[PDB]
Amino acid sequence: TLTYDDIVGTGLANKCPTLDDTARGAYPIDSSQTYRIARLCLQPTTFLVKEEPKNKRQEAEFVPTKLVTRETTSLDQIQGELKVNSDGSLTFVEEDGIDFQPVTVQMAGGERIPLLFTVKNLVASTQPNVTSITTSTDFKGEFNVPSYRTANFLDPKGRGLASGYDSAIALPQAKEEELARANVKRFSLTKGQISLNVAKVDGRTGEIAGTFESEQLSDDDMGAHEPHEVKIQGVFYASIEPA
Amino acid sequence: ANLWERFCNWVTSTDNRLYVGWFGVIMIPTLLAATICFVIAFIAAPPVDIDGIREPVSGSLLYGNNIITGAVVPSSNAIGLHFYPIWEAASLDEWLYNGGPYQLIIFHFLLGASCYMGRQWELSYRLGMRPWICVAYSAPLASAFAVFLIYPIGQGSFSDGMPLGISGTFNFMIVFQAEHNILMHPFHQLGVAGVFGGALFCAMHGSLVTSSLIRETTETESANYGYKFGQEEETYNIVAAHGYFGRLIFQYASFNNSRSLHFFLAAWPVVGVWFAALGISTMAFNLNGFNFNHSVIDAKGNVINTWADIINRANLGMEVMHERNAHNFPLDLA
Amino acid sequence: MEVNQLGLIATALFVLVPSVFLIILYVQTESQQK
Amino acid sequence: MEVNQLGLIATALFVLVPSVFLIILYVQTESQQK
Amino acid sequence: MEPNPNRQPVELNRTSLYLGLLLILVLALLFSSYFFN
Amino acid sequence: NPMWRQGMFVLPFMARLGVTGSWSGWSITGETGIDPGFWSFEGVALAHIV
Amino acid sequence: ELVNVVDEKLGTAYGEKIDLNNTNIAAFIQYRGLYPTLAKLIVKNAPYESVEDVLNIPGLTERQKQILRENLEHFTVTEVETALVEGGDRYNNGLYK
Amino acid sequence: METLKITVYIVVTFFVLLFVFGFLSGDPARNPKRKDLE
Amino acid sequence: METITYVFIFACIIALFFFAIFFREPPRIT
Amino acid sequence: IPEKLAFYDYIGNNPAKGGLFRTGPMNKGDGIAQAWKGHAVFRNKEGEELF
Amino acid sequence: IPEKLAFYDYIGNNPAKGGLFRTGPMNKGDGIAQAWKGHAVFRNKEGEELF
Amino acid sequence: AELTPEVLTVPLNSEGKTITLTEKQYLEGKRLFQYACASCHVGGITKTNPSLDLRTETLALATPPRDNIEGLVDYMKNPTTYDGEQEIAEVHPSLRSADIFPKMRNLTEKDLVAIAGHILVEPKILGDKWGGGKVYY
Numbered sequence A: 001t002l003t004y005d006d007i008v009g010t011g012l013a014n015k016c017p018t019l020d021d022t023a024r025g026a027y028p029i030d031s032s033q034t035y036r037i038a039r040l041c042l043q044p045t046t047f048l049v050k051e052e053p054k055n056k057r058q059e060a061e062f063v064p065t066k067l068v069t070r071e072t073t074s075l076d077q078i079q080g081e082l083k084v085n086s087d088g089s090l091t092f093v094e095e096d097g098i099d100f101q102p103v104t105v106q107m108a109g110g111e112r113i114p115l116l117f118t119v120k121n122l123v124a125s126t127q128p129n130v131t132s133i134t135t136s137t138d139f140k141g142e143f144n145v146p147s148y149r150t151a152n153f154l155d156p157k158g159r160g161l162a163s164g165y166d167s168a169i170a171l172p173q174a175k176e177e178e179l180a181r182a183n184v185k186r187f188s189l190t191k192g193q194i195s196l197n198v199a200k201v202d203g204r205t206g207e208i209a210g211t212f213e214s215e216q217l218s219d220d221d222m223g224a225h226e227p228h229e230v231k232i233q234g235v236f237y238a239s240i241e242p243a
Numbered sequence B: 001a002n003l004w005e006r007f008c009n010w011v012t013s014t015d016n017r018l019y020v021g022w023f024g025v026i027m028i029p030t031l032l033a034a035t036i037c038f039v040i041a042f043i044a045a046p047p048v049d050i051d052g053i054r055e056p057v058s059g060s061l062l063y064g065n066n067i068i069t070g071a072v073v074p075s076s077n078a079i080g081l082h083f084y085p086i087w088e089a090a091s092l093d094e095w096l097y098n099g100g101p102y103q104l105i106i107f108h109f110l111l112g113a114s115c116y117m118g119r120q121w122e123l124s125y126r127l128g129m130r131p132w133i134c135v136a137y138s139a140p141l142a143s144a145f146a147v148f149l150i151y152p153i154g155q156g157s158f159s160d161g162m163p164l165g166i167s168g169t170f171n172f173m174i175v176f177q178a179e180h181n182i183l184m185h186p187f188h189q190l191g192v193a194g195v196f197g198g199a200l201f202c203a204m205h206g207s208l209v210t211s212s213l214i215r216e217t218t219e220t221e222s223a224n225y226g227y228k229f230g231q232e233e234e235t236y237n238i239v240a241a242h243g244y245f246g247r248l249i250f251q252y253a254s255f256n257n258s259r260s261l262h263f264f265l266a267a268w269p270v271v272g273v274w275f276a277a278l279g280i281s282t283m284a285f286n287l288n289g290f291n292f293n294h295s296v297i298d299a300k301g302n303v304i305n306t307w308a309d310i311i312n313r314a315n316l317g318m319e320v321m322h323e324r325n326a327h328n329f330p331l332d333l334a
Numbered sequence C, D: 001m002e003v004n005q006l007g008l009i010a011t012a013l014f015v016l017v018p019s020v021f022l023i024i025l026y027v028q029t030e031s032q033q034k
Numbered sequence E: 001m002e003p004n005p006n007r008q009p010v011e012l013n014r015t016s017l018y019l020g021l022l023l024i025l026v027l028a029l030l031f032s033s034y035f036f037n
Numbered sequence F: 001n002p003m004w005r006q007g008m009f010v011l012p013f014m015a016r017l018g019v020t021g022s023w024s025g026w027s028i029t030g031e032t033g034i035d036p037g038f039w040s041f042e043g044v045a046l047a048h049i050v
Numbered sequence G: 001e002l003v004n005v006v007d008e009k010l011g012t013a014y015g016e017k018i019d020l021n022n023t024n025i026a027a028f029i030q031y032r033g034l035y036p037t038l039a040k041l042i043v044k045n046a047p048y049e050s051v052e053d054v055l056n057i058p059g060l061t062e063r064q065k066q067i068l069r070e071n072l073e074h075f076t077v078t079e080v081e082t083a084l085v086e087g088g089d090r091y092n093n094g095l096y097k
Numbered sequence H: 001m002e003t004l005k006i007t008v009y010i011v012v013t014f015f016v017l018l019f020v021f022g023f024l025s026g027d028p029a030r031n032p033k034r035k036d037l038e
Numbered sequence I: 001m002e003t004i005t006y007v008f009i010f011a012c013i014i015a016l017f018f019f020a021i022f023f024r025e026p027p028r029i030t
Numbered sequence J, K: 001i002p003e004k005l006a007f008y009d010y011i012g013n014n015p016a017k018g019g020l021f022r023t024g025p026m027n028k029g030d031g032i033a034q035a036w037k038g039h040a041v042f043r044n045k046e047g048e049e050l051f
Numbered sequence L: 001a002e003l004t005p006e007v008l009t010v011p012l013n014s015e016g017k018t019i020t021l022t023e024k025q026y027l028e029g030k031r032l033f034q035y036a037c038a039s040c041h042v043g044g045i046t047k048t049n050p051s052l053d054l055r056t057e058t059l060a061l062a063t064p065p066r067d068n069i070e071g072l073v074d075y076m077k078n079p080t081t082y083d084g085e086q087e088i089a090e091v092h093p094s095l096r097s098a099d100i101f102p103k104m105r106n107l108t109e110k111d112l113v114a115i116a117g118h119i120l121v122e123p124k125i126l127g128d129k130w131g132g133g134k135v136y137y
Ligand code: CLA
Pocket: B025, B026, B027, B029, B030, B033, B083, B084, B085, B086, B087, B103, B104, B105, B107, B108, B111, H008, H009, H011, H012, H013, H015, H016, H017, H019, H020
């Protein structure tokens, strides 16, 4: 029963709860009962970025990166509805939580890749006929990925979307066209995909834990350049509750 | 003599080309470390997220800077006043992203310059000198402390310490004016009296002594050759110099005592700069310059602007523009 | 960066011409009869 | 014309460095006694 | 410090200066076309 | 785009005898996430400066 | 072809009235009785296909319905603009005085 | 990083000990005039 | 070239510090 | 056929094609190589392969 | 209106718009002037002239 | 320009009745406003919620109307949200919450009237500065 003073500065605060190795049970779903995920935690352990090959006909791979924004990566205190569907599948509908983190990882050679690691508006479903959540249960679904910078964000020359200059004021008589992409800010909104593989289950407490893999675009600097493809892998924890 | 004794004798030896001493024992490695890290960083450090909002600022030459724009960038606001040595980072790449070089450099340098002061005491002692040159040095030193350590402590973050670069310095000064109105602060005004006055008195002394040099040379040679190092005679006529200055103003406004005069020359800029340092060091805890905003009011109650209100408008421009993505709430409280 | 292309030759001559002036004066001073 | 951008500084230093070497040597020779 | 007995004064007479300068300037006049290319 | 296309002259001599990696994580064989140790190209350079 | 979506939206009804689907909540202070209770309900139950649909917010007192009816003329609806509604910006858009 | 930390800790301790023990080694006496200052 | 120029001038200045200090004309008492 | 192999079979990488005052990297001449275009097979109207 | 006259009425020809290290001819800044685009008159939806 | 009786004549209630404050009342009003309110409402804004200011137009569109003496006095007794829907004595100084807002304890009816009058008169003097915030400094 650790207190905040036990944990502060240790790095535990960025870690998701784990389940003992004994947790290989089943958590029964009463199809007449409504359910909630009281807490969903996602702790990323690796961030991979898809390299961008030159011939455009090569098999592009996901390569490792170095995290440089420290232990600020995890999603937590996420809650939402856990619907029991007609076909016996369950669907988690994310309502709220700390469900995004800006992250910067660095590629070999120094290129920095910022992204909004997230499961915002996650909708994720199991296979049909889940009478009990088990170590064979998995969730798959989709989420939103809004712009990494929101609309008030001003670049170093004071240009922005919902605020800022709408031109390059330090170049009063430059031709506008060449600078259009940098002058006119755009707000990206794209989709990401995620899988959760349950690895442990406490059927008594209704706790589950496992691994996840998510895939999403990285920061595109409000339209100034192309995003990179990111694959995020880690562990997750969830507490299931009658609701 | 044993090894340690010999070593002590060397360290404190009056015959080394550069004096070492015990203060030197700390000074030399710390200054070397601060220097090496500073040069490498200034040339080749990647951009640093100074304000902790994932908005990295480029300080080094290789990354788009010249001498005027370049800087070793202060450590991240996320770090605040936390101690961030190299072994606290997961990697050198993280260390660099978060502005580790800044902390390494300013700590090693503050220690090293402190030991520089002490070392000035030490050598004065070994040479049979009077001890207070180190007291004169305490003024620039105090200032360094004010901008690299004290102001960060008071504001809760080394991210608000003065940047190690020319443009970074100007940045520091302007944000400082925005939030503390330092121009209207009497300690800064005394600091200005200190350095303007120091400049005046430098030129004045230099020119009075130069004006009263005793003829020892021909017109085809430099007059400097009329002085020889270690000669016991003074090289200028202070009676003539005092006759001149005393007549320029009036007699009793002028120094007839060289000791008194030189003590003045030491005291004025040192005390002034002491007050500059204390000004920064106290605005560190937000006791700010005078605020006469809307101080004059007519019979109806209309605001009658003074020059202070114009100053206020300029400060407002600085305030609203500085760190444009870092504030989410209406009051900039640190 | 799109720097000024004369900047290099400008800095080079700015340093070299007067430095060379000084070096010439110094060396011919040293070589004068001691 | 589209000339090599380092041609100018190359030519300038090609002239100046050895010319200056010689001028130094010459002047310190003249300033020697006798 | 004992002065070094191996030292020697150096000379460049005026005719040598003119020859040298000529050599440098004519070399430069020749190679500069190739430096600009 | 290997080194010999890029006008590289001492890089191949470093590689010839076993220095193939950067402190920045890349290698000349095009690997990623390699730890070259101190004797990266940068380490070799620094060594020669000292 | 590149467009600033907020400038463009200023040329629609959004630049003329309170857009029930997009406009920051502080705007509801413009008219009597909307803030904060109705404003919070309205933003919460957005978006709306038409202005009158604001009347269908579950739980509304008759007084509230009357106040809404009285203020429909000051309302509009346009397409939800992601740039204006992300970041919780309808609750706080970075503007104070 | 742990090796770097241990290294720096040892180095700093070395020089600090030098400073302290140095100033304990009859320092008032290390001046040109009066040496008996005990 | 810019970076090379800046660092070159700086390097020359440091070398100058070295000669100015260790290879100064020694002060001589008369 | 590996792109690397094909790239070796191109005269722009032949070290005996340069110039004494053509300065800098090979990339400054023909460019930074992006991709093999593939092997070109030439044929005349009668379908004979030509070289 | 003569183009020359219009061209005088343009701030790019004001001698007080420069920089100490912005070197060279004015043409190097805003460019070589080619032609007057003509006088711009602005109006709002109500057709009021705006300046 | 002078602080005239006309400047100092403000709406007493919603029914078109006015009241003319003395100069002593105006000074009392400024003093008491600084004493009990300026920490948040300096210059007619609201530091802990800038969306609501002390401009007369704003107070007039409040519920119940707060652009007259009776409205402001009532607000100082039993403050509400802008729509009148919630009583907020527990988080806003008032006579009703003098126990948890102790500077309210020595404020008399007379004092509330003076403060009210200050809030109504000051915009008549300062115009857009009142409730304007830093833009208008
Ligand atoms: C004069 C020698 C000297 C000193 C005093 C320092 C001091 C420092 N180094 Mg540096 N360093 C040095 C040489 C030195 N360095 C050398 C030669 C190298 C190359 C190997 C480095 C490489 C280096 C790196 C890479 C880093 C540092 C860092 C630091 C800082 C943290 C050190 C620490 O945690 O120690 C703690 C150790 C102790 C507290 C043990 C000492 C216990 C003694 C015996 C008693 C306690 C002393 C007491 C509290 C005060 C003394 C009182 C006095 C009146 C006598 C500190 C400013 C770090 C930094 O700058 O972070 C921002 C950092 O990352 N150093």
